[PDB]
Design a protein around this nucleic acid. Structure first.
Ligand SMILES: Nc1ncnc2c1ncn2[C@@H]1O[C@H](COP(=O)(O)OP(=O)(O)OP(O)(O)=S)[C@@H](O)[C@H]1O
Ligand SMILES: Nc1ncnc2c1ncn2[C@@H]1O[C@H](COP(=O)(O)OP(=O)(O)O)[C@@H](O)[C@H]1O
Ligand SMILES: [Mg+2]
Ligand SMILES: [Mg+2]
Ligand SMILES: [Zn+2]
Ligand SMILES: [Zn+2]
Lengths: 438, 660, 662
DNA sequence: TTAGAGAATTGGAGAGTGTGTTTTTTTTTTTTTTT
DNA sequence: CACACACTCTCCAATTCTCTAA
């Protein structure tokens, strides 16, 4: 198997080195620029890989979990070649794929597509804390102190410590991990829920466990709509039929539309051309009319409400005085009036145009579900918080339709989160003051 | 691949013969019957596979197809026999019955047999029981009425006008009767290639779900025989004895009586009286059982110390021991978990060759009444004639007789000659001349020669087949002497040549089955009573009987008091009782084995208190203890010599065994 | 070469053993292939040829084989299937694959295997009447789905690799009920750990739904029994939780040590391996029908739909055939028909969304067949849910969250408006529900989406329902001298949602009373239970009774409605927007002055939605001028008839110029 | 036939491979239907 | 993880056996 693995590695190495569209080696330049800013990855488009040599794409799409580690090895070798002067300690690079294949609905992922590469869309509803998966596992024999090493690829087939002293018997399991010499990478578990417009008739939305890795972690926040290029894989969690297997997707590329954690990662990730476009737009003498006319274009009239919605979307300016007290910079708008005046349509449009938005109805909404819900962990028996509508919509706008139908004891919970913009919780031994700048 | 092709052919033949809902004979029915016969014959002996029979049983051919052929032919035969292509409609049943007897042939497995036969024996013995189960329950089992047609067609013509070919038809049809009734459950051949675990065999029931012990017992066979009129067939076949219809018939009417006792014939709400008596007996034994159990729970914690000699403080638990010191000593005895090794050991139709005394097949009262008269009618018809028919054949081919012939002949002879004498004893309506014809000199010398020849070849089963007849020889000699020179020629040849054979078997057969030991005690009891009316010397024949191994083999029978009956204990105890004053040889009786059995006898846990066995035994043991005390008080060394075996030294042999 | 007659004469003692015989298996396969290729019904067309054509056309993977057809011809095969389905289903699956390959060569590329869904099993049981005699035999239990696990891939052909010596183990078939046992390896007798091979392995879908005895069939006051049901590939996600279904499948049993330990007896655990599923929720009055889908139409049925739709006056026939056994009430029947067909749900550029379902409110005096019309609509509509008055809470109408008793976390389960998604929801006694329960359907009736943000579950379900509610005026009698708002306790926000508001009045007219009494007595005589074999003679009698009152048969009307709903989307290209604008302006002007019915823009869109429903009735793909004038007439009539009697004549005279022609 | 020299087999202690635990649903939130 | 249990793998001297002993 060494010869075939080396041939695959060399082929994808030549793909990295030789591919160019018009006078510019796209992937050589991208790899060097990524290395310069300590971004040990390579975002490889799939049309380019198909166009270069379709046999490589066929091999990749046949058995992705066995070929992708070889492609990561090829990327690492090219990185050493083009960023290290011959005559190391460079991490195994991560391959991030970009595809334009037809999106498979999240409910259509069935027995087939197992171990295949699937591209699908959904909305993230949960993001786990970062775990630690080992890659370099320095290991030492318990009895004879035979220190060796193990390298992990993290692409589960469908590895463990050796069950041998591997160089008196030393027992069946003579290996203990040396934790001061191992090298780890961070891994995050997501949870994808299908698009509300794609669920079948009379069906609840379906979740799907997902795993990020290295540079694809801390990339999305709950509530964001994403399209994922991943491997629909299988793992047998020990947690009720016979020979059943819990399915999950191993992410190889995430393409959100609302930026990364924070907004634009708490900073500006705007390409220079689009930043110049925004600057050109801001100088338009009729920018106010352009923005007003583009808020729910199908709603006739209601010019003043559209202007107020524009002001709400932009928001004020937050101030933090030296003495400590802060002044909120968010605008709250209430729309009273007769039925049939397109208030709910305006709310639904604002839920679309705003980068971060949550649409909730007043009737079906509770106080602990609007701000923060104290929940008991089924495994560890420990209480923890789960964010509500006013935490998911943090940094954005929450649209509370049918406001007057809220129970009197549920509408009160919004009082602090609207003005002070903090949610205070003292329940089950928890005492925190979260933030809701909505 | 060969096996599944064989299964395909069997299924192909199954759908070719035809079916129901009247059964229909398909096209080329005779051709397919001949093909099946040829295939089965080829795989039976020429190839020795025993796989075609398996496929036939699987398709339930014998039940679904073969039996309806004979059933449908029965009505046509009755119509043709009562009205006043008959040859074609007659020859069709011939092949069917030939197939039936071939499948019903008993299977024998030996060392020379290959692995396939022994492997499939356990899988085909159950199907063997299935055949007889479905045959007997098939609307009163009328297939035997069709079978007897396959014999009356040939026997109808004159015997001198017999056929050199049709003669085999009689053998083939006659073998079916003995084959169906010899079907018995086999043995679970445990795979002893490795040590067995801490648990034994789970189930010893070798019966498929369709087969129940109710529907396969010999009671069912006898009821089917009575309801199918075949009693008249068996009587008329014997009524015309005046060759080939003797050897099969020797076991055709013997299999159902090979192990059935004659005691059940006479009783000596009717069934409920014995039920009440058995409830009383089991209530008595359960009452004896609870005498050891504590009045309170086990965890009451009754602890005690026995101040045994040497001021020992041995601790034994149990509040029961606080009642009696003997109970404490018994709890001391059985507390040890260590045990020694006890050594231990049918190739022919099971019977006395392997049946304990309590294996009395349950019989319906009407069925018992019918069987009481059936065998009596057979005796009144052709018993001695049948014996004399095979006397000539028995005188020839002495070394050419397979071991099956002896076990199927001697047991028959002994059982029937015993039945005739017991029936004459209970009721005087039967003359002794009805069995006195067996006292022929040539028959007696030939059976004695066979008995003596079986000794040197270590054929213990064949020899046990001979003692059961030898007992009745002496019994009939006594009966014809008391109720009366013809008896002298039969009962004078055991002077010197035969004394060794009769006096050696008790000394050696004690290491074998219970019935082998039971035969010799009856032999000695009979021989000690036949000669009592003429005394060659009474004091000389008993001299060779008073030997230590003989006492050992007599006392080894007494250890089974949990199953010994009144007569079994009576004979063993009377052997010693009759020599108490007549022989005066009690010195050889001084082993601890007899004393411990006496302790067991008088204890309530042994013999019944309400019965008529423990009273005279208790009185005789009271005298035994007086004799023991008198003999032990006069010799201090005899206190410990009572345990050790006797000595071969000259002076002590008369000093201790006779007291000077 | 065995004939059908041999198949009936079992040779192997056991049936399963009889079926497993290669000759019997070949004979059965040949007979089943002949049945599939050559079975023809009364009308003469080959049923299963068309079924296989449709199967391949949509890559269905499942062949719906009626059990009555299998029983009528080659009844021995039907008996075998009903007695030992485990092997008969395999044989008949192979036969179905062969037939499909005959119609569609090289179909193995699309789907490797074709499953057979047996339908219309005669002997229907309940989860209480199952016994040990039904083990390993086809059953047709009926119950309501309670739980439903996710669709977990399951091992189909396990190919283990020996760890000690070997590297390949036989492709054992997983039975979906018990774990595959390896025991001693073939390469060496020594035992050790084993694990599967990821090289050559195929998976199948697996879902374990938990049937529970339906509250309708449970004896009153008794606890309901329940059995777990295994849904294998192509059957997953076909039964939503809370729905009522009829499950045909093998009733197998597997040994588990937990149950034996708990009960202390060598007792086994039973389970149903589903072979087909038919949902009976919302069509509980539809007994006597055949097939796994009452609303599925054959090609001939579609041709008949297209033939009758071209008729002039098909709309009138459809309207007159809504409540055939209910006299009069043509306005109510028109409104119900419009609601049943529904409108087209628009979506402008993906931003603006317009409701496409029509809501109807039946308000009137008692004993005017308002609840009976609702029961009929429940019988007819595809997905219908019935909820009444106080017996329908706020969260049971839309959606509720619960703490899962097994996994102990909050999960969201739908209510009436979700179980009736893309269907109809029927609310009897609308005015008697609690206000805080009635206000819970405001969003799902206009936005058609339920928004839940409780217990940390922030999500927006989809409920494209069409509410049909029967109300009752204040005091029990509709006072014609008062406006509509003074006769009901409902407010404007809930009154504006209903597109058509039909006011029913119970007046005393001797001619009307005579005609109604005659109709009711005739209907009571007709429906009397005491009023060429049994099946088609009974069907002929049913058709004879139906043709008296309903111009179009009901069993065909249901399929017609479903076909129009799922395959027609009329467009409003050719229209006179000036007429609709003028009608809307007049409606608002007369609403503000001398009126109380709220006329918002929703009542402008109601005209378009009703016009689209009328265009659907003719199966047309474009809304004609007649279909718009009829919608305008319906809306203005519903507006006018709800006004006080003082101003009704003036309003009718004012609006007469728009309904010119009728 | 007896006291005594030779073959022949297999059960009872022990080397060893793999097990089996401890191991938990209280109290506290959040929902929901009745009250 | 390790101490205790259940049990497969494995093994010589006391217990049985039959050829040559007295
Ligand atoms: N000015 C308008 N322009 C376009 N469409 C409108 C306008 N006013 C109303 N509509 C339509 O009328 C309907 C109004 O329904 P909604 O806006 O969802 O309910 P609402 O206006 O919030 O009144 P409520 O919620 O019952 S108080 C939608 O179909 C709108 O598209
Ligand atoms: N127009 C009608 N034609 C036939 N039957 C009618 C009509 N109106 C009422 N009925 C009969 O009245 C009975 C009761 O109707 P019901 O369902 O109580 O109406 P509501 O609930 O509005 O009072 C029904 O059995 C129905 O047959
Ligand atoms: Mg609204
Ligand atoms: Mg009503
Ligand atoms: Zn080591
Ligand atoms: Zn192996």
């Amino acid at each position: 198997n060494d010869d075939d693995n080396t041939e695959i590695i060399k082929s994808f190495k030549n793909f990295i080195l030789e591919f160019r569209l018009d006078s510019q080696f796209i992937y050589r330049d991208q790899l060097r620029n990524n290395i310069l800013v300590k971004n040990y990855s390579l975002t490889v488009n799939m049309e380019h890989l198909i166009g270069y040599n379709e046999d490589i794409y066929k091999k990749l799409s046949d058995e992705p979990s066995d070929i992708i580690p070889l492609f990561e090895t090829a990327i690492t070798q090219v990185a050493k070649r083009i960023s290290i002067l011959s005559r190391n300690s460079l991490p195994t690079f991560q391959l991030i794929l970009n595809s334009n294949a037809n999106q498979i609905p999240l409910r259509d992922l069935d027995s087939e597509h197992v171990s295949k590469i699937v591209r699908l869309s959904g909305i993230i509803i949960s993001t786990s804390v970062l775990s630690s998966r080992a890659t370099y596992l320095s290991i030492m024999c318990r009895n004879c102190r035979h220190t060796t090493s193990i390298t992990i690829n993290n692409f589960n087939s469908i590895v463990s410590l050796p069950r041998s002293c591997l160089s008196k018997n030393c027992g069946p399991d003579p290996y203990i991990i040396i934790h001061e010499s191992s090298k780890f990478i961070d891994q995050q578990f997501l949870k994808l829920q299908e698009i509300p417009e794609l669920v079948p008739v009379g069906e609840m939305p379906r979740n799907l466990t997902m795993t990020c890795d290295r540079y694809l972690t801390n990339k999305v926040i709950p509530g964001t709509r994403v399209t994922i290029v991943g491997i629909y894989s299988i793992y047998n969690s020990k947690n009720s039929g016979v020979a059943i297997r819990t399915p999950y997707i191993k992410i190889l590329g995430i393409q959100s539309d609302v930026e990364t954690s924070s907004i634009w990662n708490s900073v500006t990730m705007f390409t220079e051309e689009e930043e110049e476009e925004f600057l050109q737009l801001s100088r338009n003498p009729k920018l106010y009319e352009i923005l007003t006319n583009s808020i729910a274009p199908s709603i006739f009239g209601n010019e003043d409400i559209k202007k107020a919605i524009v002001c709400l979307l932009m928001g004020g300016s937050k101030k933090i005085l030296p003495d400590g007290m802060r002044l909120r910079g968010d605008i709250n708008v209430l729309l009273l009036g007769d039925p049939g005046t397109a208030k709910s349509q305006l709310l639904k449009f604002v839920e679309k145009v705003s980068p971060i938005a949550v649409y909730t109805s007043g009737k079906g909404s509770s106080a602990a579900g609007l701000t923060a819900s104290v929940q008991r962990d089924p495994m560890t028996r420990e209480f923890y918080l789960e964010g509500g509508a006013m935490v998911l919509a943090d940094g954005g706008v929450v649209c509370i339709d049918e406001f007057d139908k809220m129970r009197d004891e549920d509408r009160v919970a919004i009082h602090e989160a609207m003005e002070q913009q903090t949610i205070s919780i003292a329940k089950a031994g928890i005492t925190t003051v979260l933030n809701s700048r909505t | 691949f060969s096996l599944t092709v064989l299964r395909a052919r069997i299924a192909l033949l199954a759908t070719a013969i035809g079916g129901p809902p009247p059964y229909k004979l398909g096209d080329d029915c005779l051709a397919c019957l001949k093909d099946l016969k040829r295939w089965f014959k080829l795989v039976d002996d020429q190839q020795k596979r025993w796989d075609v029979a398996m496929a036939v049983a699987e398709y339930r051919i014998l039940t679904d197809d073969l039996l309806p052929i004979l059933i449908d032919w029965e009505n046509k035969c009755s119509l043709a026999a009562k009205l006043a292509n008959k040859a074609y409609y007659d020859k069709i049943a011939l092949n069917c019955l030939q197939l039936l007897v071939l499948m019903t042939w008993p299977l024998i497995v030996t060392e020379q047999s290959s692995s396939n036969q022994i492997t499939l024996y356990g899988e085909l013995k159950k199907h063997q029981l299935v055949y007889k189960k479905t045959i007997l329950s098939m609307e009163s089992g009328k297939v035997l009425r069709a079978a007897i047609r396959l014999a009356l067609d040939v026997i109808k013509i004159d015997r001198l006008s017999r056929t050199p070919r049709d003669n085999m038809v009689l053998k083939l049809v006659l073998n079916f009767f003995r084959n169906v009734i010899a079907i018995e459950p086999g043995e679970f051949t445990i795979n002893t290639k490795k040590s067995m675990p801490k648990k034994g065999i789970t189930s010893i029931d070798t019966l498929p779900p369709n087969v129940s012990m109710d529907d396969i017992s010999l009671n069912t066979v006898i009821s089917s025989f009575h309801k199918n009129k075949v009693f008249g067939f068996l009587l008329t076949l014997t009524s015309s004895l005046s060759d080939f219809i003797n050897i099969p018939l020797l076991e055709i009417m013997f299999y159902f009586t090979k192990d059935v006792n004659q005691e059940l014939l006479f009783p000596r709400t009717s069934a409920g009286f014995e039920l009440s008596k058995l409830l009383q007996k089991e209530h008595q034994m359960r009452k004896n059982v609870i005498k050891h159990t504590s009045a309170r729970h086990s965890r009451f914690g009754g602890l005690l110390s026995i101040q045994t000699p040497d001021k020992t403080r041995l601790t034994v638990s149990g509040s029961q021991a606080l009642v009696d010191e003997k109970i404490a000593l018994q709890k001391l005895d059985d507390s040890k978990k260590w045990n020694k090794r006890i050594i231990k050991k049918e190739g022919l139709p099971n019977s006395l060759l392997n049946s304990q005394t309590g294996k009395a097949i349950f019989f319906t009262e009407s069925n018992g009444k019918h069987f009481k008269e059936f065998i009596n009618n057979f005796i009144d018809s052709g018993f001695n004639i049948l014996l004399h028919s095979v006397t000539n054949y028995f005188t020839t081919e002495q070394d050419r007789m397979v071991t099956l012939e002896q076990v199927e002949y001697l047991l028959f002879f002994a059982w029937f000659v015993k039945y005739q004498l017991l029936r004459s004893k209970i009721d005087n309506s039967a003359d002794i001349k009805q069995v006195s014809e067996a006292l022929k000199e040539v028959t007696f010398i030939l059976v004695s020669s066979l008995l003596r020849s079986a000794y040197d070849l270590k054929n213990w089963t064949v020899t046990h087949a001979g003692m059961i007849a030898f007992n009745e020889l002496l019994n009939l000699v006594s009966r014809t002497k008391a109720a009366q020179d013809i008896e002298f020629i039969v009962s004078r040849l055991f002077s010197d040549e035969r004394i060794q054979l009769l006096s050696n078997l008790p000394k050696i057969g004690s290491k074998y089955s219970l019935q082998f030991m039971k035969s010799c005690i009856e032999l000695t009891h009979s021989v000690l009573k036949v000669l009592e009316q003429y005394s060659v010397n009474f004091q000389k024949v008993q001299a060779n009987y008073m030997t230590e191994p003989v006492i050992e083999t007599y006392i080894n029978f007494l250890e089974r008091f949990r199953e010994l009956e009144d007569d079994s204990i009576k004979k063993v105890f009377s052997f010693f009782h009759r020599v108490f004053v007549q022989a005066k040889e009690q010195a050889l009786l001084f082993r601890f084995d007899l004393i411990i059995l006496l302790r067991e006898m008088l204890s309530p846990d042994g013999l019944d208190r309400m019965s008529r066995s423990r009273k005279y035994v208790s009185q005789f043991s009271d005298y035994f203890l007086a004799r023991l005390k008198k003999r032990l008080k006069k010799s201090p060394a005899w206190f410990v010599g009572l345990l050790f075996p006797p000595l071969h030294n000259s002076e002590v042999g008369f000093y201790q065994r006779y007291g000077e | 070469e065995l004939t059908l007659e041999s198949l009936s004469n079992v040779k192997a003692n056991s049936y399963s053993e009889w079926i497993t015989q290669p000759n019997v298996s070949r004979t059965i396969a040949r007979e089943l292939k002949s049945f599939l290729l050559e079975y023809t019904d009364e009308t003469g067309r080959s049923v299963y040829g068309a079924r296989i054509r449709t199967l391949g056309e949509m890559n269905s993977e499942s062949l719906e084989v009626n059990y009555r057809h299998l029983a009528e011809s080659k009844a021995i095969l039907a008996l075998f299937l009903a007695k030992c389905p485990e092997e008969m289903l395999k044989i008949f699956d192979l036969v179905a694959m062969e037939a499909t390959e005959l119609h569609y060569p090289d179909y193995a590329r699309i789907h490797s295997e074709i499953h057979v869904r047996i339908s219309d099993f005669p002997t229907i049981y309940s989860l209480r009447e199952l016994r040990e005699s039904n083990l390993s035999s086809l059953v047709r239990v009926t119950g309501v789905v309670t739980r439903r696990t996710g669709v977990f891939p399951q091992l189909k052909y396990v190919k283990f690799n020996c760890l000690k010596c070997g590297s390949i183990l036989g492709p054992f078939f997983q039975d979906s009920n018990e774990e595959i046992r390896i025991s001693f390896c073939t390469n060496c007798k020594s035992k050790g750990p084993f694990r599967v091979n990821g090289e050559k392995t195929v998976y199948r879908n697996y879902q374990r739904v938990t049937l529970q005895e339906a509250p309708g069939t449970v004896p009153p006051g008794r606890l309901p029994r329940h059995r777990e049901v295994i849904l294998l590939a192509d059957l997953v996600d076909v039964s939503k939780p809370g729905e009522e279904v009829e499950v045909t499948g093998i009733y197998k049993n597997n040994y588990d040590g937990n149950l034996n330990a708990k009960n202390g007896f060598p007792v086994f655990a039973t389970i149903i391996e589903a072979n087909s599923i038919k949902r009976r929720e919302g069509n509980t009055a539809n007994e006597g029908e055949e097939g796994l889908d009452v609303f599925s139409w054959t090609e001939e049925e579609e041709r008949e739909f297209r033939k009758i739709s071209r008729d002039r006056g098909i709309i009138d026939k459809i309207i007159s055939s809504m409540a055939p056994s209910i006299y009069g009430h043509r306005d109510i029947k028109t409104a119900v028909a419009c609601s049943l067909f529904g409108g087209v749900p628009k979506n402008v550029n993906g931003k603006h969304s317009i409701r496409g379902d029509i809501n109807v409110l039946l308000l009137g005096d008692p004993g005017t067949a308002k609840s009976q019309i609702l029961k009929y609509v429940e019988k007819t509509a595809h997905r219908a849910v019935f909820a009444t008055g106080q017996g329908a809470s706020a969260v049971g109408l839309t959606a509720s969250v619960r703490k899962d008793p097994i996994t102990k976390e909050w999960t969201l389960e739908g209510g009436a408006l979700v179980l009736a998604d893309k269907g109809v929801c029927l609310i009897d006694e609308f005015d008697k529900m609690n206000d805080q329960d009635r206000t819970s359907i405001h969003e799902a009736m206009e936005q058609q989406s339920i928004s839940i943000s409780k217990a940390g579950i922030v999500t927006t379900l989809q409920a494209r329902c069409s509410i049909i509610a029967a109300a009752n005026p204040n005091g029990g009698r509709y006072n014609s001298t008062l406006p509509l708002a003074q006769n009901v306790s409902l407010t404007e926000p809930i009154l504006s949602r209903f597109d058509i508001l039909c006011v029913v009045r119970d007046l005393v007219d001797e001619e009307a009373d005579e005609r109604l009494a005659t109709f009711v007595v005739d209907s009571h005589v007709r429906s009397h239970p005491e009023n060429l074999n049994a099946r088609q003679r009974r069907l002929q009698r049913q058709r004879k009774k139906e043709e008296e009152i309903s111009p179009i048969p009901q069993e065909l009307l249901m399929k017609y409605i479903h076909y129009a709903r799922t395959k027609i989307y009329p467009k409003l290209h050719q229209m006179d927007m000036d007429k609709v604008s003028r009608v809307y302006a007049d409606l608002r002007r007369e609403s503000i002055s001398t009126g109380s019915f709220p006329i918002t823009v929703r009542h402008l869109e109601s005209i378009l939605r009703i016009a689209e429903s009328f265009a659907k009735m003719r199966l047309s793909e474009f809304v004609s001028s007649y279909d718009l004038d009829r919608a305008i007439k319906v809306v203005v009539d519903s507006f006018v008839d709800a006004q006080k009697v003082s101003v009704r004549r003036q309003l009718r005279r004012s609006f007469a110029i728009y309904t010119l022609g009728h």
